[PDB]
Symmetry: D3
Subunit: 144 residues, 6 copies
């Protein structure tokens, strides 16, 4: 079980806690092969979740949740854990807002499973910050 | 000079460092009357700023910058400084995205200089998180 | 996917990285539903593992490895991460030595997949430290 | 009063708090000539001590206590103080279990007063981790 | 608005909270262009202030307050924030006691607005510690 | 060997490292019966000590050194170790300046070996901060 595979396995696993059915996304922040924070797609802690009260629609989009990647950063902010010089493992490549936040927090590498359209501006930013992005599949694993 | 005036003063002050001339915004995160982090409206660190290379326009707004409030939070995440049970002073009441993140981070009070229209969804979230929001003016001070 | 299932799942998962084929053990330390540290059954970092150079046998058992539970604790010590008032998820209920250390470290709950015979001395210590111990199964999950 | 002598003086001194009369052992973790944690030979905090209720005998050995060296590491784990890149001062050279834990926590040097039989495997591990072990006497000091 | 100017602006601003009218002094500790602690001239927190009960005179001097510079260091001590490798911005160059404390805490540079008589011993200490001291004016800024 | 005797013993012990022969002072900061910082009477780190280059006399006293109690506090500031809600053990009851700083730092108890005349202003401050002060002797111990 390789380190890369373990972290993607974990991204996949925490994505399963997503509480807005329009997106199951998971994210894992890693420093020297340790998990230091994780996120999934869900509403503000101790507020309503889409699963229970329905989506918060605006402009044909649901806006209730904090994204998985942003949630991982906000865990670090909340708990006072350093995100600097970490790397992230995500089920889906991040939106441009999340990317900007990840790069600003000092995330040095992004490994993703799926990706649909990567923002060119996200690619420009990653180039300037010398941050690599690399696809890797979720390992086939069975537990229980 | 009151604590409230000191912090709003420093919000205004940091707002001036904004590097996108479409919005001068400043944010000050505070725990037990100490400034623990600040943000202004700016592009990702060590990348191009609008002041230098122009705006990054999309659907009519500039997407180059991280917002001041988000930047303050990302400082906490990057440096591993706890934002839990803090309050924030902002020159402008936050967008819904920033509001979500501040609340997720454990911010318990938002003091703002100018608010324009507070999103009903933001009022709902703040109600559920029992977060106080209050207008306060930038004090008149002359330095030098 | 429940919090309990998520953590036991991740215990099983990290257990697979064990580098001594006589015991596959995994440990997950948790504070406020965040993973703060993990351990597996392995030799001292940057030294020989059994997988590569054989076991270090003595009086009929291998002494090369640090146990998974102890490794999780040592991660906390090495990195200066607080293990106080945490809980742990382990694939196997800990030996008496590990039990002592977890309790000394401030661990307040032990959730285990398989326990075999819990030492009477361990029951005494857990009673005095008011530490709960509870069996929970590895959930059935397929990844990929 | 040399730094080496001060730390050994301290090891000796904290060994005096040992609550199992079958071993008076003291340990001091040091980073840049500062004491960051200490340990002595005693049972789990807030549980019974040998001094009061008798030894916990098994296999002709007392197993009630956490060793001094392990207690120093567990203080770091408990309080979230980093043991990485520290050095330790101990009254007696550590057993193999303790040695493995010390090396795993990033302890870089071991200075001991007495030593009886050093485990060859402990010597192999110390060689591989490039960790030196050096005898030094307790200074003759009188206070009061 | 330059970084130097922003920090001096802040020193000036926090000096305005001074609660002994015989000295309005402000100090700002900075690490990588972030404010990590500030101080002003005032009595021990939660004790009487000169503004309310009068000065504490001894030897023709008021001795009630902790100096601004020392208060900034003591905030770091109190809150457990590292002052090592910081730089300080102060309205007035520090007395010799404060200077010794600043250099001992690892402050690497002192930028001051006014200065009356710099202690030669302070200059000797700054030379030995390779710490530069540099005058800079408070920027002319108007808010509100 | 009691906790109180252990700490006073270590105050005496560190006092011996003083590098100004006009005063041998030692300070030990303690949180939950752990030593978190110590100070002795000494010049700024990596500068000249009196032992080597003579005293720095002014108005009849030596001003070269940082006092032991202040040094203990500055260790906390430098290293980012929290001195809040600690207690201190000192060989001599502190000067008024040190008293102010300890109290500002959140020290809640002063245990001292020798006090000579406690400043009325110090009694006032300690009363307002509800800080206990208590005499305790250096225990008789012989090491080696
Ligand atoms: C604990 C934790 C929460 N979060 C985020 C995801 C959600 O947006 C939010 C939920 O926090 P909570 O509401 O406190 O968690 P919960 O046990 O109630 O689970 P849920 O509401 O999802 O049923 O916090 C993380 O991103 N990572 C984490 O490790
Ligand atoms: C230091 C600091 C930066 N930031 C943010 C604002 C910007 O988006 C980004 C810029 O960081 P940098 O590019 O590293 O700062 P700079 O000195 O180059 O100043 P600038 O580029 O603005 O001319 O970081 C804060 O929000 N708070 C802070 O305390
Ligand atoms: C990173 C990490 C290591 N460890 C422990 C397990 C092993 O005993 C030891 C190995 O660390 P390393 O030797 O540094 O890790 P590695 O990448 O070489 O993997 P391996 O040697 O196992 O093939 O550290 C944890 O318990 N938790 C962790 O998060
Ligand atoms: C405070 C402290 C405790 N310990 C360990 C040693 C013992 O195994 C255990 C005792 O903690 P406690 O029982 O909390 O300490 P105590 O005041 O009751 O003293 P004792 O029980 O020994 O009479 O904690 C250290 O190793 N280092 C330390 O600095
Ligand atoms: C919060 C804070 C306090 N201090 C110091 C300055 C004063 O000596 C002391 C006052 O703390 P407090 O008395 O707790 O602050 P306050 O709100 O009562 O204001 P004041 O008493 O001045 O009216 O703490 C700093 O130096 N920096 C800081 O950031
Ligand atoms: C390491 C340490 C230093 N100090 C203070 C005391 C001195 O004022 C100053 C000296 O630090 P250094 O000069 O770095 O220590 P040293 O090994 O050179 O010893 P010395 O100069 O005394 O012979 O730092 C403490 O108060 N506590 C500590 O734990
Ligand atoms: Mg919830
Ligand atoms: Mg820049
Ligand atoms: Mg290895
Ligand atoms: Mg006890
Ligand atoms: Mg006050
Ligand atoms: Mg020296
Ligand atoms: Zn939704
Ligand atoms: Zn996103
Ligand atoms: Zn722009
Ligand atoms: Zn915003
Ligand atoms: Zn083996
Ligand atoms: Zn074990
Ligand atoms: Zn015993
Ligand atoms: Zn041992
Ligand atoms: Zn006064
Ligand atoms: Zn001063
Ligand atoms: Zn002298
Ligand atoms: Zn003093």
């Amino acid at each position: 079980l390789s380190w890369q595979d373990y972290f993607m396995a974990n991204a996949e696993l925490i994505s399963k806690r997503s509480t807005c059915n329009r997106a199951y996304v998971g994210a894992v922040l890693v420093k020297n092969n340790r998990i230091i924070a994780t996120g999934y797609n869900g509403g503000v802690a101790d507020t309503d979740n889409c699963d229970d009260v329905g989506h918060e629609m605006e402009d044909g989009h649901c806006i209730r949740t904090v994204h998985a990647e942003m949630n991982a950063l906000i865990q670090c902010a909340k708990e006072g854990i350093s995100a600097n010089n970490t790397e992230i493992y995500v089920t889906h490549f991040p939106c441009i807002n999340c990317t900007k936040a990840l790069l600003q927090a000092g995330v040095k590498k992004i490994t993703y499973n799926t990706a649909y359209r990567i923002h060119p501006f996200a690619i420009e930013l990653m180039t300037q910050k010398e941050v690599e992005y690399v696809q890797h599949d979720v390992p086939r694993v069975k537990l229980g």
